[PDB]
């Protein structure tokens, strides 16, 4: 008898639970997509490190080559400074 009111009360309650858990889902998606787009910043931030490392390396090389030349030019001011004093 009362059966077709006892299964009408659980249905309301379940229909309501389903709406809620579909609303939490909807919140969780909006959130995920915001994440995905900040997440997209990590491959790039890692890439930024590498290219920065590289840029520094070109600069060190370039510095060295100016140390090579300053040393070579002083090295060839060795094979001359020996003469100038050794002979008068």
């Amino acid at each position: 008898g009362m059966q077709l009111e006892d299964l009408r009360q659980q249905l309301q309650q379940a229909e309501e639970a389903l709406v809620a858990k579909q609303e939490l889902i909807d919140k969780l998606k909006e959130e995920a997509a915001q994440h995905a787009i900040v997440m997209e910043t990590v491959p790039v931030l890692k890439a930024q490190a590498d290219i920065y490392k590289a840029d520094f390396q070109a600069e060190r090389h370039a510095r060295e080559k100016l140390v090579e030349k300053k040393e070579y030019l002083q090295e060839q001011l060795e094979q001359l400074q020996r003469e100038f004093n050794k002979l008068k």
């Binding site: 997209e40 910043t41 491959p43 790039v44 931030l45 890439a47 930024q48 290219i51 920065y52 840029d55 520094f56 070109a58 600069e59």
Partner: protein
């Protein structure tokens, strides 16, 4: 005849009108055309990956309203130097097609001196705002002389 977004890590988005057939290098050109950033100082990234100047947009699966990331190099390509009349020597980042205005601007970005107060010299000859670096055959690692106008 799509269009795309370009975004640095520092914020600031810009849009470019592009073609699926355009090359990555073609874009850098555009990214320079409006942003004033030399192609040799930009590294573009789509789908986690640095994009090669060689290939096109099409190649990398890039449809309308795609966001391309752009990392800025600290150091690009060709550097020249500028010695002040005190010995203070600084370096600039340039390209052969850079104008003297487009050089006086960077002087100021370091020294803080308005371009109208700057007299640049390259072995005895005064440089002119209108002409370009290559016009005065200034090559890499070459040094420039800054005296006040």
């Amino acid at each position: 005849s799509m269009q795309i977004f370009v975004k640095t890590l520092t914020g600031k988005t810009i849009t470019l009108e592009v073609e699926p057939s355009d090359t990555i290098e073609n874009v850098k050109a555009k990214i320079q055309d409006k942003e004033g950033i030399p192609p040799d100082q930009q590294r573009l990234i789509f789908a986690g990956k640095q994009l090669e100047d060689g290939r096109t947009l099409s190649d990398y699966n890039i449809q309308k309203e795609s966001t391309l990331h752009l990392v800025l190099r600290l150091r690009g390509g060709m550097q020249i130097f500028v010695k002040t009349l005190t010995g203070k020597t600084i370096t600039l980042e340039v390209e052969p097609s850079d104008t003297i205005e487009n050089v006086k601007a960077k002087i100021q970005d370091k020294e803080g001196i308005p371009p109208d107060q700057q007299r640049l010299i390259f072995a005895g000859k005064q440089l002119e705002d209108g002409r370009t670096l290559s016009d005065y055959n200034i090559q890499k690692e070459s040094t420039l002389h800054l005296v006040l106008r």
